[PDB]
Design an enzyme around this catalytic site. Structure first.
Site, mmCIF file in Angstrom:
data_model
loop_
_atom_site.group_PDB
_atom_site.id
_atom_site.type_symbol
_atom_site.label_atom_id
_atom_site.label_comp_id
_atom_site.label_asym_id
_atom_site.label_seq_id
_atom_site.Cartn_x
_atom_site.Cartn_y
_atom_site.Cartn_z
ATOM 1 N N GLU B 41 0.828 -1.199 0.000
ATOM 2 C CA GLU B 41 0.000 0.000 0.000
ATOM 3 C C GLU B 41 0.852 1.233 0.000
ATOM 4 O O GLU B 41 1.960 1.211 0.540
ATOM 5 C CB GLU B 41 -0.947 0.017 1.193
ATOM 6 N N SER B 348 -40.331 -47.182 -24.017
ATOM 7 C CA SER B 348 -41.033 -48.418 -23.601
ATOM 8 C C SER B 348 -40.692 -48.911 -22.195
ATOM 9 O O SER B 348 -41.384 -49.808 -21.684
ATOM 10 C CB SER B 348 -40.826 -49.530 -24.617
HETATM 11 C C1 LIG Z 1 -41.167 -48.107 -27.095
HETATM 12 O O1 LIG Z 1 -40.042 -47.736 -26.855
HETATM 13 C C2 LIG Z 1 -41.905 -47.732 -28.371
HETATM 14 C C3 LIG Z 1 -41.903 -48.778 -29.520
HETATM 15 N N1 LIG Z 1 -41.319 -49.967 -28.942
HETATM 16 C C4 LIG Z 1 -40.008 -50.249 -28.892
HETATM 17 O O2 LIG Z 1 -39.166 -49.626 -29.515
HETATM 18 N N2 LIG Z 1 -39.752 -51.289 -28.088
HETATM 19 S S1 LIG Z 1 -38.276 -51.847 -27.647
HETATM 20 O O3 LIG Z 1 -38.622 -52.635 -26.525
HETATM 21 O O4 LIG Z 1 -37.433 -50.724 -27.532
HETATM 22 N N3 LIG Z 1 -37.697 -52.813 -28.876
HETATM 23 N N4 LIG Z 1 -38.367 -53.052 -30.078
HETATM 24 C C5 LIG Z 1 -37.633 -53.805 -30.850
HETATM 25 C C6 LIG Z 1 -38.024 -54.086 -32.255
HETATM 26 C C7 LIG Z 1 -37.556 -55.176 -32.982
HETATM 27 C C8 LIG Z 1 -37.940 -55.318 -34.347
HETATM 28 O O5 LIG Z 1 -37.533 -56.277 -35.003
HETATM 29 C C9 LIG Z 1 -38.783 -54.317 -34.945
HETATM 30 O O6 LIG Z 1 -39.163 -54.408 -36.255
HETATM 31 C C10 LIG Z 1 -39.211 -53.263 -34.190
HETATM 32 N N5 LIG Z 1 -38.847 -53.160 -32.873
HETATM 33 N N6 LIG Z 1 -36.442 -54.094 -30.171
HETATM 34 C C11 LIG Z 1 -35.339 -54.947 -30.695
HETATM 35 C C12 LIG Z 1 -34.701 -55.930 -29.690
HETATM 36 O O7 LIG Z 1 -35.615 -56.948 -29.270
HETATM 37 C C13 LIG Z 1 -33.442 -56.551 -30.301
HETATM 38 O O8 LIG Z 1 -32.720 -57.269 -29.299
HETATM 39 C C14 LIG Z 1 -36.488 -53.430 -28.967
HETATM 40 O O9 LIG Z 1 -35.615 -53.397 -28.094
HETATM 41 N N7 LIG Z 1 -41.366 -46.466 -28.839
HETATM 42 C C15 LIG Z 1 -42.179 -45.483 -29.253
HETATM 43 O O10 LIG Z 1 -43.392 -45.584 -29.269
HETATM 44 C C16 LIG Z 1 -41.521 -44.242 -29.697
HETATM 45 N N8 LIG Z 1 -41.229 -44.119 -30.976
HETATM 46 O O11 LIG Z 1 -41.608 -45.151 -31.903
HETATM 47 C C17 LIG Z 1 -40.738 -45.670 -32.940
HETATM 48 C C18 LIG Z 1 -39.959 -44.578 -33.692
HETATM 49 C C19 LIG Z 1 -41.691 -46.250 -33.992
HETATM 50 C C20 LIG Z 1 -39.806 -46.763 -32.397
HETATM 51 O O12 LIG Z 1 -39.867 -47.120 -31.231
HETATM 52 O O13 LIG Z 1 -38.972 -47.324 -33.097
HETATM 53 C C21 LIG Z 1 -41.238 -43.214 -28.650
HETATM 54 C C22 LIG Z 1 -41.715 -43.347 -27.391
HETATM 55 S S2 LIG Z 1 -41.269 -41.930 -26.460
HETATM 56 C C23 LIG Z 1 -40.477 -41.245 -27.877
HETATM 57 N N9 LIG Z 1 -39.827 -40.022 -27.925
HETATM 58 N N10 LIG Z 1 -40.611 -42.057 -28.879
#
Ligand SMILES: *C(=O)[C@H](CNC(=O)NS(=O)(=O)n1nc(-c2cc(O)c(O)cn2)n(C[C@@H](O)CO)c1=O)NC(=O)/C(=N\OC(C)(C)C(=O)[O-])c1csc(N)n1
Ligand SMILES: *C(=O)[C@H](CNC(=O)NS(=O)(=O)n1nc(-c2cc(O)c(O)cn2)n(C[C@@H](O)CO)c1=O)NC(=O)/C(=N\OC(C)(C)C(=O)[O-])c1csc(N)n1
Lengths: 600, 604
Positions: B41, B348
């Site tokens: 200071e 889901s």
């Molecule tokens: C839930 O999340 C819902 C639609 N369901 C799922 O995606 N379920 S899952 O349990 O995540 N899941 N589904 C499948 C699966 C397998 C297939 O062969 C086909 O053709 C479709 N799905 N699998 C595969 C496994 O078993 C492999 O080991 C899973 O794990 N989601 C929604 O309702 C929403 N979006 O819908 C779409 C875009 C159609 C989608 O899920 O794909 C959603 C809910 S909240 C949000 N922002 N979106």
């Protein structure tokens, strides 16, 4: 346990509160306060859990503005006990721990309120409070009622000097110490100084004229009383009188005698004709300052000076700061002109230079030449613009002969003088390297000037100005005791002997020359104190931008200054001997009243 | 005496240093340090003799910024030095701080600090406290900060940080100045498993999505950090089958073809280019890459730090004890803890909470539900495959995540009763919308809340609260806090009984539906582990923006999530069962290794 400030006569003058912590027993906490904290955050993963852990922190949580714990925040922010807080106030406080600066109600009241209402909403959702409790709480403003924890109402410049200096050198931690600071301040002398400064500056102000009302058409609540001046709103204007509303709501009447002084200010060197009616002085809705008599039966129109001043009084034997006034009034400006106001001392430097001439072989009777003298383009001239020829050294000092100073400065040399100015207490980088220093061109603090003059009063020794006598801890133990450098160790009724900067003969001869200054010209003003132990020197800088008086007796050194903060002329007629000397006279006369003669 | 963090076995994992004060005897103070304060200071009125006598009262308590109280704490915090090792410039720097420890701080304002310091150095010269030579040497000197880290969190960073950040969130910085000993619920073995599983799983996703190019190009190597067994390197030479990189230690390493041949270029989330045919197609000179050593530092390969993120949270379903927590790929990449702060849509993974209410009122896993088209205003919810199955049993609609069935059950169950249930399951009121989209998993959730929810199935229908502190001790070993959690099953171990939020039958039947999902469904995921006490549900949000797996046994509930911080598609083929399930499998298999079967009990 706050930082306490005491005078030398044991008067508690100031209390500075630091970090506050008022521990409370968890059981004494209102359940609504606990719920406010419990609803402060969206998630807790330590509900019941946070409630059990809260007891460990509820008395130590930092909550902004030196508040540690809930009780300290209640006291600091609202002047309340925890049980006195409204639901809104508990929600406000519970919002602070996360960020005591981002959510502080003082710094960011909108963000604080935003946070508080978010908490209030959570309390409602959790069912801690009802919709009625919620509605009432959200409606509530911040309602801060902060108690001032910095008490400084008796001698403000003295109290502030301790607080600001400790904080400057050691930071905020210095205040959190709970110490009892025992200063060198003489309470009687401090009150004299405050009154002398106030009166002296009002005397200057009144002769320079009425500068109008401080404000027009503004709310009266926006103005604060100080220096025994009360904000008033003009409500009626008559022929010889005017009615005015006070801050208590009463209407007072100022008669002609209380406003007749109001010749209008034109400039520093001109005032208009004496007013012939109340209408030439005040307008309705004008904001004026009033002052009652001792009775409170009569009121007069006063004015707060635009001019400033200061007074510093030290003991010449040890540098003890006995009285300090930094301005017209501490409320008006917290700036302390005695310690922080750099100004040119004018002719108050001449005794330092003339002491060097005495040192190098001259006497007060030595013949010196008051004649024209040129140094390059520089032709220093005397105040009167006249020359006196061969005169004794003392005549040259009591008549402020510039040519003699410049000639002595040639004989003694700039460097020897600059080194001497430094030893008297002046700053190296503030002292120019030319012949103008003989006239008082360096920048100085009035405290440095008092340090310098003490040398004359104490026999030629350098003392250091000090304000702390001793510091005690909260438990009465002495932890610091001042060890000042003494000019005269036997005069006390041991330790640090002050350095001799002048021959005894030189301090003695200079002290007698300075007593002559008082027993002639200024002088005829100062000899109104029926005392024979006073010496002093007046000073005025170019165009009266500063008016100084530095003087002493063997027991007290006082330096008074009058001037405007933004340097302006005080007026043609306003020499040191006219504006500063009256303040010095009232102080010295009362301060020294009933003390025997004390000379060098 | 710092804030100490311990795991459940009484092992020290973190030390958080608060306010520091190392008192010294005035006699031990170098005279140059005293002179630095004396010249700090312009004026003193207590030459500078009286400030020297008063300085002894404050020299050990003056606050000097960054938790430093006293000269020795500032020397240690700012320079990793004792007062006697400080240079004249360092003493001048510190002496400048008391007036304003924020305006003059060398960390926050190094320009304003150095300005202040040199002003002091000049004063010391003027007062003759130091010589022109001492002055010249001192002004030339840079700030030279050498700050020791006082926050040691090197063993299990997400766990240590969880304690520090949570205590600071609820009680402020004063919580760390307590010297307290925090005894957490964290299982060290399980915490290491979780960290490794997350790192491996995210790297697996990353490698299959292709080489995205260098971390940076033409940037200073001093600006990069090593973490997750990856070292930042600057490419200095590019050959045919190899390259050269400069490390942060100054060494130049060589990456051979085998260490970079994997680098098929990233085209988009759903496409990778052809296998690279030369080192020039992968790296440029001045490119900032990531290199990894094998067992012994003899060879190096080109690795990639995932852009994708993840998390893992493991709790005990009986009391909510947080056993393992991983907030991201690595704590030194991002301090953000996705398990406690990462708000995402569960997809889901919410379905079991809704289907439990249907069982509660009082449908069965065999009850016939309608998988047909549905419209609610303008909203037409569609299934993942875009097909309809007609009348199917409840358990099949859950396993196959039939959106139309969920929406239909949501009318049967009612929005408010479901929202109440979601809130009862641990979700946030203001995060649950007031509409039929909640049946699809549109609310914003934290993975910790999802674990709280699933614990209900594992524990027989009780609401537990997740907790990380077992007990707190003061510095002197006195117990000042002992956790009194709400228990689902008090005989299974105050004691506090958790509230029942579901019928035993509903928790029992849902747990069994979830076991079939992992055993009979999800391509035999329990048969990958080799345990009969596992149940779980996969989840995928719209456009594979999130991949979730929530699963349990009677003694441990784990929730894994994979996704990008700025929500983008993981890829067409990237469901929950693809991205999150492998992490959940490695964790659960190792965590549960050598523990007997532990399933839900039916108290009818
Ligand atoms: C839930 O999340 C819902 C639609 N369901 C799922 O995606 N379920 S899952 O349990 O995540 N899941 N589904 C499948 C699966 C397998 C297939 O062969 C086909 O053709 C479709 N799905 N699998 C595969 C496994 O078993 C492999 O080991 C899973 O794990 N989601 C929604 O309702 C929403 N979006 O819908 C779409 C875009 C159609 C989608 O899920 O794909 C959603 C809910 S909240 C949000 N922002 N979106
Ligand atoms: C020194 O201060 C020098 C000129 N001297 C003074 O003004 N000296 S004084 O001691 O302040 N002083 N002189 C007088 C006075 C009395 C008179 O009768 C007449 O005619 C003239 N002067 N008084 C009044 C009382 O004695 C009451 O009678 C004093 O108090 N100053 C300078 O060299 C500087 N400025 O001088 C000015 C103001 C221009 C001047 O000479 O008038 C100066 C020095 S450093 C700086 N910036 N300016």
């Amino acid at each position: 346990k706050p930082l306490q400030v005491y005078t030398a006569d044991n008067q508690l003058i100031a209390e500075y509160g630091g970090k506050l912590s008022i521990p409370v027993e968890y059981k004494q906490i209102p359940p609504n306060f606990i719920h406010a904290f419990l609803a402060a955050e969206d998630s807790s993963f330590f509900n019941l859990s946070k409630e059990d852990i809260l007891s460990l922190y509820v008395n130590k949580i930092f909550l902004g503005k030196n508040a540690y714990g809930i009780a300290a925040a209640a006291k600091i922010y609202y002047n309340k006990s925890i049980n006195e807080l409204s639901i809104a106030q508990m929600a406000m406080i519970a919002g602070l721990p996360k960020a005591p600066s981002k959510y502080n109600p003082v710094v960011n009241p909108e963000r604080a309120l935003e946070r508080r209402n978010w908490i209030l909403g959570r309390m409602l959702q959790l069912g801690y409070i009802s919709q009625a409790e919620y509605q009432k709480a959200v409606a509530e403003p911040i309602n801060l009622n902060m108690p001032n924890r910095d008490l400084n109402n008796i001698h403000p410049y003295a109290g502030e000097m301790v607080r600001s200096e400790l904080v400057k050198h050691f930071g905020e931690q210095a205040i959190d110490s709970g110490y009892k600071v025992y200063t060198t301040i003489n309470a009687k002398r401090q009150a004299i100084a405050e009154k002398a400064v106030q009166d002296g500056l009002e005397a200057y102000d009144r002769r320079h004229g009425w500068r109008g009302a401080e404000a027009h058409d503004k709310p009266l609540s926006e103005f604060r009383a100080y220096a025994n001046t009360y904000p008033a709103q003009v409500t009626k204007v008559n022929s010889s009188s005017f009615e005015a509303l006070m801050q208590d709501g009463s209407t007072v009447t100022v008669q002609w005698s209380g406003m007749s002084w109001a010749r209008p200010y034109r400039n520093a060197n001109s005032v208009g004709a004496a007013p012939s009616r109340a209408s030439q002085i005040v307008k309705v809705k004008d904001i004026v300052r009033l002052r009652p008599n001792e009775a409170k039966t009569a009121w007069s129109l006063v004015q707060v000076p635009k001019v400033q001043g200061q007074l510093i009084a030290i003991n010449p034997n040890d540098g003890s700061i006995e009285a300090i006034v930094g301005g017209y009034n501490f409320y008006q400006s917290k700036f302390n002109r005695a310690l922080q106001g750099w100004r040119q001392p004018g002719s108050t430097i001449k005794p330092f230079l003339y002491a060097l001439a005495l040192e190098r072989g001259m006497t007060p009777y030595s013949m010196v030449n008051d004649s024209p003298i040129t140094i390059g383009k520089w032709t220093p001239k005397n105040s009167d613009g006249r020359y006196l020829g061969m005169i004794p050294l003392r005549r040259a000092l009591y008549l402020s002969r510039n040519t003699v100073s410049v000639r002595l400065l040639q004989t003694v040399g700039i460097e020897r003088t600059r080194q001497l100015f430094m030893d008297f207490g002046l700053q190296e980088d503030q002292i120019p390297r030319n012949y103008t220093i003989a006239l008082g061109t360096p920048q100085v603090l009035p405290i440095q000037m008092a340090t310098g003059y003490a040398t004359f009063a104490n026999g030629g020794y350098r003392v250091q100005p000090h304000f702390i006598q001793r510091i005690e801890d909260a438990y009465g133990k002495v932890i610091y005791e001042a060890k000042p450098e003494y000019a005269c160790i036997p005069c006390i009724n041991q330790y640090r002997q002050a350095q001799r900067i002048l021959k005894s003969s030189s301090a003695y001869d200079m002290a007698n020359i300075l007593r002559d200054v008082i027993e002639h010209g200024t002088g005829r003003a100062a000899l109104k104190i029926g005392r024979s132990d006073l010496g002093g020197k007046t000073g005025t800088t170019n165009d009266a931008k500063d008016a100084w008086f530095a003087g002493f007796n063997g027991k007290l050194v006082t330096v008074t200054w009058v001037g405007f903060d933004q340097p302006t002329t005080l007026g043609r007629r306003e020499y040191g001997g006219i504006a500063a000397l009256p303040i010095w006279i009232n102080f010295m006369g009362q301060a020294l009243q009933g003390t025997p003669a004390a000379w060098v």
